Design a protein around this ligand. Structure first.
Ligand SMILES: [Cl-]
Ligand SMILES: [Cl-]
Ligand SMILES: [Cl-]
Ligand SMILES: [Cl-]
Ligand code: NA
Length: 129
């Protein structure tokens, strides 16, 4: 599923991400835009052999099991394919664990390079929330 901007904002808000660990909703929407272009089915292979999955490009090296990343962990305790569903619940719960682990949203390279320090509220402007 390819979400619309406000559709995704509303789904993320319902799942508890607005101001989660101090990150306003616009941060999460911005991160999703530049990580996946709002596409739940996005995958990208990394040089170390891990793969990023889903709307928030969650990495198989630490967070989910895809059966092809030797020596990796599965800290969200999910198959990585669960992160590609049109239902973002799995991705959101896993993202909550990630953002709590210490480095906050810096875990997402696109957020660090393209959202951090910008007017992120613009990503939810106009939406009925
Ligand atoms: Cl915001
Ligand atoms: Cl772009
Ligand atoms: Cl594996
Ligand atoms: Cl933080
Ligand atoms: Na893994």
């Amino acid at each position: 599923k390819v979400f619309g901007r406000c559709e995704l904002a509303a789904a993320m808000k319902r799942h508890g991400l607005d101001n989660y660990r101090g990150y306003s909703l616009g941060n999460w929407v911005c991160a999703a835009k530049f990580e996946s272009n709002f596409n739940t089915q996005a995958t990208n292979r990394n040089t170390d052999g891990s793969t990023d999955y889903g709307i928030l490009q969650i990495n198989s090296r630490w967070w989910c099991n895809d059966g092809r990343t030797p020596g990796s962990r599965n800290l969200c305790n999910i198959p990585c394919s669960a992160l590609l569903s049109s239902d973002i619940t799995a991705s959101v719960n896993c993202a909550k664990k990630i953002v709590s682990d210490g480095n906050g949203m810096n875990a997402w390279v696109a957020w660090r390079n393209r959202c951090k320090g910008t007017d992120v509220q613009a990503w939810i402007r106009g939406c009925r929330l």
